[PDB]
């Protein structure tokens, strides 16, 4: 067989489905039952496929007023899918179909015709078959077994009957046989179609008893196999994925586009029954990325390359000991919601992320190491297996990375799944009231932007902005980043100008406050899950540059710390009815980590003594006893203690404080005079960084910094910041993650739970008559997570809302 050809009866399929799913239309009117029906059934056959696919149409007089509208969309759909369309002017779909089937058959093709209209059953033969829109595989055997006939005599058997429209009103019966129960029993000695005179009533009587009624029933044979046409059998074209999407979304059926990805699938490997062996990698497909709000569309497993596919995903989740594969965490969150305890196991992403924190997405990890992140549960599983193979083999030779995976990454996965699957209760009543409050704050600011500038224009609509600034002129350049386009303008434009004009400042206040409101106060009440009644923030274990947890929906991280609004927003997050929120926070961990990593005895000493690092630093910088340190002094000490963390720079500090460049340089000198090892540390961090090509955290977390050795000052000053900005933050991240991993086991027994983790804070939720005890357990665990040169202090709080516990 030179191939398989799937001939589609676009014409009769389009007609059939127009008189099916009669309800379907896009919510705005626009009917869609014909397009849908056609698309759905097309896919079914295309699932079983053929090398070459040709959709035949009629190439009007009394058809439905809406039919052609939909038929035109059907063809648009055929095109956009890269399938061959064929209509020969003057020929009826069926004739072309029959003829295409014959041609392809003769040319050494196995031909499968997707149609419902029974006429084509006469062409049934080996090579040529029929796929019913409904299902089955109408074959010649199917004819003998379910009808008792053979193709050669099936358009005949159909001529003494009448389907629908195949006009023949009158059969009688005879021994109850009607014409149908008989059908085959007239095939012995023709009569109607060749010789046979005297015979029984109906059987014969009715045959001749209907002249003219037969010189129309010949329409069954309206399947001439000799239509003169060329069109050759080529394999599928490329689909217009940009417009298939635009198309489907216009009919509101973009919702099920994923199905169409399942035809351009890289050759099916070998399979096996459902329950995959213990140790197989799972692949899965969800209706939406957010696991809590998603529907598990498909679940598959891979072992040794043999893909196993679940017949029903949900019941199937019960056959797994754990979720082992890409985005394993996301499946455990779904299973959790589904009341199933399926903990996250190995995941290639965790391995990739350790080997290199630039590996942040499955799409990219997959592409980078010889694979592809598809949308088929089965391919994502096999991919999940080869990636683990390829990647475990490398990480294996690295003890520091292996330790991290085994003691931090892998178990953090399981802790992440419970936090995401648990959610936080929100005070929706407060969210709405708060929104009322914040709405007006924005109003007054817009009003003031009209009160001044005169013409009450509308902010944000960037066309105006330029204009209001021509009615009161003042406009130069910005800097070097983001240049000239309408985006590079809205990016850095105006900021430079906020300085001396209230109008260009109130504009910031508005423009920004709306974002904070739209990002943190409005989406929130809507993110309250129906089944849980809680918001389920999402936690990405990989994602960041420092190794810090990334969260989204909402990004708690970017919620403004220590401001009238950020504080107001945290009040939104509340404790369950009879529970209390326990927020624990690591006081100055980056500094306690810098002291450890630098080894600076004076830094180590302050933390050991239990002293205020900003006052002490001020003492040794401005030569006055701690008791005599004044507000300004502790202010310069606090910022330098803050700036040293990422170097900052003399000018930066010179600017962060109202001080001549000169004085800021002296301040830095004094800082390193009191902290020599801190300077030495930075110096060496960049050396090993430059030599080795990467830096690390206390625990071994690597980040490649090639740009330390650049040409452009502006550029080697970037890599240099990040260069030591990672060991410090990286170490602080690692201590938190590890803390979470130790603490988790004990909150279960304490009946408490872990909710959020932002910056260097961990928010727990515990039963009222438990909160105090849980708080003390967590402080212990957190403080003694890992032995460093100085103590670790955890400021803790308890309360009904996140803002009560405060930090
Ligand atoms: C121990 C208490 C010290 C009291 C404050 C000391 C301030 C000294 O500050 C000076 C800088 O201004 C000088 O340029 C540098 C580098 O050569 O030496 C520093 O010690
Ligand atoms: Zn047909």
Picking from 542, 539, 538, the residue whose alpha carbon sits closest to that of residue 360 is 542
Picking from 610, 666, 597, 675, the residue whose alpha carbon sits closest to that of residue 636 is 666
User: Helix 67-80 and helix 241-250: axis angle, to 10°?
Assistant: 150
Q: How many helices (H) and strands (E) does the chain have?
A: 30, 19
DSSP state of 582: E
The residue whose CA has the least distance to atom 10 of ligand 1 is 670
What is the rounded distance in angstroms from the CA atom of residue 26 to the CA atom of residue 68? 17
Task: Yes or no: say if 545 and 357 are a contact pair by the CB < 8 Å rule.
Answer: yes
Ligand with smallest separation from the Cα of 602 = 1
Ligand with smallest separation from the Cα of 671 = 1
Distance, CA of 269 to chain centre: 26
* CA 112 to ligand 2 centroid distance, Å: 12
Q: What are phi and psi of 181, to 5 degrees?
A: -60, -15
User: Is the Cα dihedral 121, 126, 132, 137 positive or negative?
Assistant: positive
* CA 598 to ligand 1 centroid distance, Å: 21
What is the rounded distance in angstroms from the CA atom of residue 399 to the CA atom of residue 412? 19
Token pair 């007089």 is at which residue? 61
**Ligand 1 atom, smallest distance to 674 CA:** 1
User: Residue 81, Cβ neighbours under 10 Å: how many?
Assistant: 22
Antiparallel, parallel or unpaired: β 425-426 and 579-587: unpaired
Q: What are phi and psi of 486, to 5 degrees?
A: -60, -20
* CA 670 to ligand 1 centroid distance, Å: 5
Task: Yes or no: say if 279 and 385 are a contact pair by the CB < 8 Å rule.
Answer: no
* Residues in the chain, overall count: 807
What is the rounded distance in angstroms from the CA atom of residue 687 to the CA atom of residue 700? 17
Q: What are phi and psi of 152, to 5 degrees?
A: -50, -30
User: Residue 734, Cβ neighbours under 10 Å: how many?
Assistant: 23
The residue whose CA has the least distance to atom 19 of ligand 1 is 670
**Ligand 1 atom, smallest distance to 620 CA:** 2
* CA 673 to ligand 1 centroid distance, Å: 7
- Both tokens of residue 793? 């202090």
* CA 638 to ligand 1 centroid distance, Å: 18
DSSP state of 184: G
What is the rounded distance in angstroms from the CA atom of residue 199 to the CA atom of residue 184? 16
Distance, CA of 265 to chain centre: 20
Token pair 């180590």 is at which residue? 604
Give one DSSP letter per residue of 2-15, joined into a string. -EEEEEE-HHHHHH
The residue whose CA has the least distance to atom 12 of ligand 1 is 666
Distance, CA of 298 to chain centre: 15
Resolution in Å equals 2.4
* CA 122 to ligand 2 centroid distance, Å: 12
Alpha helices in 396-427 (DSSP H): 399-404, 410-422
- Both tokens of residue 341? 């305890």
554: cis peptide before it, omega within 30°?
A: yes
| 415 Cβ contact partners less than 8 Å away, ≥ 6 residues apart | 740, 741, 744, 754
Token pair 């936090």 is at which residue? 419
The residue whose CA has the least distance to atom 20 of ligand 1 is 670
In the 3-class helix/strand/coil scheme, how is 114-173 assigned residue by residue?
Answer: ECCCHHHHHHCCCCEEEECCCCCCECHHHHHHHCCCCHHHCCCHHHHCCCCCCCCCCCCC
* CA 255 to ligand 2 centroid distance, Å: 30
Mutate which of 673, 674, 675, 679 for ligand 1 pocket (most atoms within 8 A of beta carbon): 673
Longest dimension (CA), the chain: 133
User: Helix 601-609 and helix 676-692: axis angle, to 10°?
Assistant: 120
* CA 211 to ligand 2 centroid distance, Å: 27
Antiparallel, parallel or unpaired: β 550-552 and 538-540: antiparallel
**Ligand 1 atom, smallest distance to 619 CA:** 2
Antiparallel, parallel or unpaired: β 128-131 and 109-114: parallel
The experimental technique behind this entry is X-ray
* CA 685 to ligand 1 centroid distance, Å: 25
**Ligand 1 atom, smallest distance to 666 CA:** 12
Q: After which residues is the chain broken (C to N over 2.5 A)?
A: 59
Task: Yes or no: say if 754 and 744 are a contact pair by the CB < 8 Å rule.
Answer: yes
Picking from 301, 587, 564, the residue whose alpha carbon sits closest to that of residue 438 is 564
| 563 Cβ contact partners less than 8 Å away, ≥ 6 residues apart | none
* CA 120 to ligand 2 centroid distance, Å: 6
| 184 Cβ contact partners less than 8 Å away, ≥ 6 residues apart | 147, 148, 149, 157
User: Residue 120, Cβ neighbours under 10 Å: how many?
Assistant: 25
Task: Yes or no: say if 732 and 720 are a contact pair by the CB < 8 Å rule.
Answer: no
Task: Yes or no: say if 371 and 386 are a contact pair by the CB < 8 Å rule.
Answer: yes
Picking from 46, 44, 45, 70, the residue whose alpha carbon sits closest to that of residue 57 is 70
Cα end-to-end span (Å), the chain: 73
Ligand with smallest separation from the Cα of 95 = 2
**Ligand 1 atom, smallest distance to 624 CA:** 4
Ligand with smallest separation from the Cα of 15 = 2
* CA 117 to ligand 2 centroid distance, Å: 5
**Ligand 1 atom, smallest distance to 623 CA:** 4
Task: Yes or no: say if 46 and 263 are a contact pair by the CB < 8 Å rule.
Answer: yes
The residue whose CA has the least distance to atom 16 of ligand 1 is 669
What is the rounded distance in angstroms from the CA atom of residue 679 to the CA atom of residue 673? 9
Picking from 675, 652, 672, the residue whose alpha carbon sits closest to that of residue 664 is 652
Distance, CA of 74 to chain centre: 29
Task: Yes or no: say if 134 and 20 are a contact pair by the CB < 8 Å rule.
Answer: no
Domains, the chain: 1-150 (3.40.50.1010), 151-223 (1.10.150.20), 275-421 (3.30.420.10), 422-536 (1.20.1060.10), 537-588+733-807 (3.30.70.370), 589-732 (1.10.150.20)
Task: Yes or no: say if 9 and 93 are a contact pair by the CB < 8 Å rule.
Answer: yes
Picking from 497, 492, 486, 498, the residue whose alpha carbon sits closest to that of residue 461 is 486
* CA 799 to ligand 1 centroid distance, Å: 46
* CA 684 to ligand 1 centroid distance, Å: 23
Mutate which of 666, 667, 668, 672 for ligand 1 pocket (most atoms within 8 A of beta carbon): 666
**Ligand 1 atom, smallest distance to 622 CA:** 5
State the Cα torsion 720-722-725-730 to the nearest 10°. Answer: -140
Ligand with smallest separation from the Cα of 616 = 1
Task: Yes or no: say if 149 and 143 are a contact pair by the CB < 8 Å rule.
Answer: yes
- DSSP lists the bridge partners of residue 426 as 573
User: Residue 336, Cβ neighbours under 10 Å: how many?
Assistant: 19
Over the range 207-229, which residues count as b (16 or more CB within 10 Å of their CB) and which as e? beebeeeeeebebbeebebebee
Q: Quote the strand ranges of 354-446, DSSP E.
A: 425-426
| 120 Cβ contact partners less than 8 Å away, ≥ 6 residues apart | 9, 94, 97, 98, 101, 113, 130, 223
What is the rounded distance in angstroms from the CA atom of residue 762 to the CA atom of residue 523? 23
The SS3 assignment for 550 reads strand
Picking from 306, 405, 432, the residue whose alpha carbon sits closest to that of residue 349 is 405
What is the rounded distance in angstroms from the CA atom of residue 579 to the CA atom of residue 325? 35
Task: Yes or no: say if 784 and 590 are a contact pair by the CB < 8 Å rule.
Answer: no
**Ligand 1 atom, smallest distance to 621 CA:** 5
What is the rounded distance in angstroms from the CA atom of residue 9 to the CA atom of residue 398? 60
Picking from 101, 107, 138, 118, the residue whose alpha carbon sits closest to that of residue 227 is 101
Give one DSSP letter per residue of 5-74, joined into a string. EEEE-HHHHHHHGGGSSTT-B-TTS-B-HHHHHHHHHHHHHHHH--SEEEEE-----S--TTHHHHHHHH
Ligand with smallest separation from the Cα of 101 = 2
The residue whose CA has the least distance to atom 8 of ligand 1 is 670
Picking from 172, 181, 177, 234, the residue whose alpha carbon sits closest to that of residue 205 is 172
The residue whose CA has the least distance to atom 1 of ligand 1 is 620
The residue whose CA has the least distance to atom 15 of ligand 1 is 669
* CA 97 to ligand 2 centroid distance, Å: 7
List residues near ligand 1 (CB under 6 A): 620, 623, 666, 669-670, 673
Residue 198: exposed, middle, or buried by beta-carbon count in 10 A (0-12, 13-18, 19+)?
exposed
Picking from 694, 678, 758, the residue whose alpha carbon sits closest to that of residue 726 is 694
- DSSP lists the bridge partners of residue 282 as 301
Ligand with smallest separation from the Cα of 220 = 2
The residue whose CA has the least distance to atom 9 of ligand 1 is 670
The residue whose CA has the least distance to atom 14 of ligand 1 is 666
Q: How many CA atoms lie within 13 A of 283 on its CB side?
A: 27
In the 3-class helix/strand/coil scheme, how is 778-806 assigned residue by residue?
Answer: HHHHHHCCCCCCCCCEEEEEEECEHHHHC
User: Residue 458, Cβ neighbours under 10 Å: how many?
Assistant: 10
Tell me the C-alpha to C-alpha distance, in Å, between residue 87 and each of 65, 112, 220, 664.
22, 18, 20, 82
User: Residue 611, Cβ neighbours under 10 Å: how many?
Assistant: 14
* CA 499 to ligand 2 centroid distance, Å: 75
The SS3 assignment for 470 reads coil
Mutate which of 669, 672, 674, 676 for ligand 1 pocket (most atoms within 8 A of beta carbon): 669
**Ligand 1 atom, smallest distance to 673 CA:** 20
Ligand with smallest separation from the Cα of 637 = 1
Q: What are phi and psi of 117, to 5 degrees?
A: -55, 120
Question: What are 85-92's contacts with CB under 8 Å, separation 24+?
Answer: 85/10, 85/54, 85/55, 85/57, 86/54, 86/55, 86/56, 86/57, 86/231, 87/56, 87/57, 87/58, 87/59, 88/59, 88/227, 88/229, 89/59, 90/59, 91/59, 91/227, 92/58, 92/222
């Amino acid at each position: 067989p030179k191939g398989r050809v799937l001939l589609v009866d676009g014409h009769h399929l389009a007609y059939r489905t127009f008189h099916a799913l009669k309800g379907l239309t896009t919510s705005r009117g626009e009917p869609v039952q014909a397009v849908y029906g056609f698309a759905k059934s097309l896919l079914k056959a295309l699932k079983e496929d053929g090398d070459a696919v040709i959709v035949v149409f009629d190439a009007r007089a009394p058809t439905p007023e809406d039919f052609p509208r939909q038929l035109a969309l059907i063809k648009e759909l055929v095109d956009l899918l890269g399938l061959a369309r064929l209509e020969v002017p003057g020929y009826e779909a069926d004739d072309v179909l029959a003829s295409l089937a014959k041609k392809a058959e003769k040319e050494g093709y196995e031909v499968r015709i997707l149609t419902a209209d029974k006429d084509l059953y006469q062409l049934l033969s080996d090579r040529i078959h029929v796929l019913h829109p409904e299902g089955y595989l109408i074959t010649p055997a199917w004819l003998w077994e379910k009808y008792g006939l053979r193709p050669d005599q099936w358009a005949d058997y159909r001529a003494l009957t009448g389907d629908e429209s195949d006009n023949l009103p009158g059969v009688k019966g005879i021994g109850e046989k009607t014409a149908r129960k008989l059908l085959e029993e007239w095939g012995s000695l023709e009569a109607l179609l060749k010789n046979l005179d005297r015979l029984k009533p109906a059987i014969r009587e009715k045959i001749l008893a209907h002249m003219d009624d037969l010189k129309l029933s010949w329409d069954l044979a309206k399947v001439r196999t000799d239509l003169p046409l060329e069109v050759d059998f080529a394999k599928r074209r490329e689909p217009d994925r940009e417009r298939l999407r635009a198309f489907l979304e216009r009919l509101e059926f973009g919702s099920l586009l994923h199905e169409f990805g399942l035809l351009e699938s890289p050759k099916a490997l070998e399979e096996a029954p459902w329950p995959p062996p213990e140790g197989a990698f799972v692949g899965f497909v969800l209706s939406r990325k957010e696991p809590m709000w998603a529907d598990l569309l498909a679940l598959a497993a891979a072992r040794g390359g043999r893909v196993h596919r679940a017949p029903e995903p949900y019941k199937a989740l019960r056959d797994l000991k754990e979720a082992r594969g890409l985005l394993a965490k996301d499946l455990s969150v779904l299973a959790l919601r589904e009341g199933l305890g399926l903990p996250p196991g190995d995941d290639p992403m965790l391995l990739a992320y350790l080997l290199d924190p630039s590996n942040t997405t499955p799409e990219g990890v997959a592409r980078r190491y010889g694979g592809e992140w598809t949308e088929e549960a089965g391919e994502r599983a096999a991919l999940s297996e080869r990636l683990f193979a390829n990647l475990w083999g490398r990480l294996e030779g690295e003890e520091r990375l292996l330790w991290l995976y085994r003691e931090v990454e892998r178990p953090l996965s399981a802790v992440l799944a419970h936090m995401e699957a648990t959610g936080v209760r929100l005070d929706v009543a407060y969210l709405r009231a708060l929104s009322l409050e914040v709405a007006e704050e924005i109003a007054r600011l817009e009003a003031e932007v009209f009160r001044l500038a005169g013409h009450p224009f509308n902010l944000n609509s960037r066309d105006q902005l330029e204009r209001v600034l021509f009615d009161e002129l003042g406009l130069p350049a910005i800097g070097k980043t983001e240049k000239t386009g309408k985006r590079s303008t809205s990016a850095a434009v105006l900021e430079a100008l906020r300085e001396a004009h209230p109008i260009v400042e109130k504009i910031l206040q508005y423009r920004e406050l709306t974002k904070l409101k739209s990002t943190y106060i409005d989406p929130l009440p809507d993110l309250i899950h129906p089944r849980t009644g809680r918001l389920h923030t999402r936690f990405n274990q990989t994602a960041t540059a420092t190794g810090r947890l990334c969260c989204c929906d909402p990004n708690l991280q970017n919620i403004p710390v220590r401001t009238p609004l950020g504080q107001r927003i945290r009040r939104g997050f509340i404790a369950e009815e009879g529970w209390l929120l326990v927020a624990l926070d690591y006081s100055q961990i980056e500094l306690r980590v810098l002291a450890h990593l630098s080894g600076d005895e004076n830094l180590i000493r302050v933390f050991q003594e239990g002293r205020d690092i900003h006052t002490e630093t001020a003492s040794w910088m401005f030569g006055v006893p701690r008791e005599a340190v004044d507000p300004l002094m502790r202010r310069a000490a606090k910022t330098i203690n803050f700036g040293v963390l990422y170097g900052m720079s003399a000018h930066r500090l010179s600017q962060e404080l109202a001080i001549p460049y000169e004085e800021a340089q002296a301040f830095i000198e004094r800082y390193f005079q009191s902290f020599p090892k801190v300077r030495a540390w930075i110096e060496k961090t960049l050396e090993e960084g430059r030599r080795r090509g990467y830096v690390e955290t206390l625990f071994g977390r690597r980040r490649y910094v090639p740009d330390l050795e650049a040409r452009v000052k502006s550029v080697r000053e970037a890599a240099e910041r990040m260069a030591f900005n990672m060991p410090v933050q990286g170490t602080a991240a690692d201590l938190m993650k590890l803390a979470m991993v130790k603490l988790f086991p004990r909150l279960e027994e304490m009946g408490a739970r872990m909710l959020l983790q932002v910056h260097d804070e961990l928010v727990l939720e515990a039963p009222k008559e438990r909160a105090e005890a849980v708080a003390r357990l967590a402080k212990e665990v957190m403080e003694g997570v890992y032995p460093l040169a100085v103590p670790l202090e955890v400021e803790v709080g308890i309360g009904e809302d996140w803002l009560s516990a405060k930090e």
